[PDB]
Amino acid sequence: AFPPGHFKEPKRLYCKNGGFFLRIHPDGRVDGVREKSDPHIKLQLQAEERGVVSIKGVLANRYLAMKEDGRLLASKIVTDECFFFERLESNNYNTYRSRKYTSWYVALKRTGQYKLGPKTGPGQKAILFLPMSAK
């Protein structure tokens, strides 16, 4: 598990697939971008309970959610679709697994689009995110 401080400061989440940072747009679209200065990739992780986080786009003021068909969007209000198990994998990247749809992961495709929940799974490059400083 992670200590305090992981949650104190905002983060960028760097995806192994394509080198995309996870981006939360003002209108609730979620996607990836390679540019580290994009203002919409500054995220805030918040511990909801042990090993569970919500992920907020700071500038968008919206929380990452995974929907029942597997799509990603970001909502103004926190709901049960906004919670993820955060786990450090053996390769030192993290995964984010839906607490509601427990086989599905937050993931980005090589195109920059999100990858639909049902196509995700362990061992994919698409599900691996490295948190780092937002500075």
Numbering used by the authors: 20 to 154
What does the paper say about this structure?
Canonical FGFs including FGF2 act as a paracrine and/or an autocrine by forming ternary complexes with FGF receptors (FGFRs) and heparan sulfate proteoglycans (HSPGs) on the cell surface. Through these signaling pathways, FGF2 regulates diverse cellular responses and has beneficial effects on wound healing, wrinkle reduction, and protection against neomycin-induced hair cell loss. While the therapeutic potentials of FGF2 are widely recognized, a significant challenge hindering its broader application is inherent instability.
To improve the thermo-stability of FGF2, we designed two mutants harboring four-point mutations: FGF2-M1 (D28E/C78L/C96I/S137P) and FGF2-M2 (D28E/C78I/C96I/S137P) through bioinformatics, molecular thermodynamics, and molecular modeling. We successfully solved the high-resolution (1.40 Å and 1.48 Å, respectively) crystal structures of FGF2-M1 and the FGF2-M2/SOS complex. The crystallization of FGF2-M1 was successful in the absence of SOS. The RMSD value between the structures of the FGF2 mutants was 0.144 Å for all Cα atoms, indicating that the introduction of mutations did not affect the overall structure of FGF2. The D28E mutation is situated at the end of the N-terminal loop (residues 20–28 in the structure of FGF2-M1) independent from the β-trefoil fold of FGF2. It has been established that the electron-rich π face of the indole ring forms a CH-π interaction with the partially positively charged hydrogen atoms adjacent to the carbonyl and amide nitrogen of P137. Therefore, S137P seems to improve the thermo-stability of FGF2 by anchoring the beginning and end of the β10–β11 hairpin such as a knot.
